């Protein structure tokens, strides 16, 4: 189907190359998140995203707004989308929530970005959502 075509098996095989590769592409990322959503873990990827976008913020306002939100969202533990972060990273931000910058969150993003790439990614590779992408003529 030239007109309509979604989810290509050619990109999947490549996605495996590296975690980043998968993210780079929308399809790959989306699918990856789905797997987590079912396990109520998406919260992790949710933070990773807000970051990549946070940097694309304009002016101090956007940085402050997004910062406060994302902070009391993932950063903080008493939050719903609270992700697994280092004590310091959580504290430093809590106090530096007023002096946040574009090159500040970057640190936190790295923490999570890895957490997933470690398990999330691997586990995702063996996830139905992923497999389907290729739907190899042989299971196992």
Structure description:
With 140 residues, the protein is mainly alpha-helical. It folds into two domains: 10-39 and 120-140, Regulator of G-protein Signalling 4, domain 1 (Orthogonal Bundle), CATH 1.10.196.10; 40-119, Regulator of G-protein Signalling 4, domain 2, CATH 1.10.167.10. The protein has eight helices and no strands. The chain has helices spanning 9-15, 19-24, 26-38, 43-54, 59-75, 87-95, 106-125, 128-134. The two termini are 29 Å apart. Inhibits signal transduction by increasing the GTPase activity of G protein alpha subunits thereby driving them into their inactive GDP-bound form. Binds to G(i) alpha-1, G(i) alpha-2, G(i) alpha-3 and G(q) alpha.
Based on the model shown, name its key terms.
140 residues; mainly alpha; Regulator of G-protein Signalling 4, domain 1; Regulator of G-protein Signalling 4, domain 2; 2 domains; signaling protein; RGS domain
Topology:
Elements: H1 9-15, H2 19-24, H3 26-38, H4 43-54, H5 59-75, H6 87-95, H7 106-125, H8 128-134
Keywords: Cytoplasm, Phosphoprotein, Signal transduction inhibitor
Domain RGS: 18-134
GO cellular component, one term: cytoplasm
The CATH architecture name of the largest domain reads Orthogonal Bundle
Protein structure class: mainly alpha
Estimate nothing, just give the exact number of structural domains.
Answer: 2
Portion in beta strands: under 5%
The shape is elongated
Question: Which bin fits the share of residues in helices?
Answer: 55-70%
Q: What is the compact description of this entry?
A:
This protein has 140 residues and is an all-alpha fold.
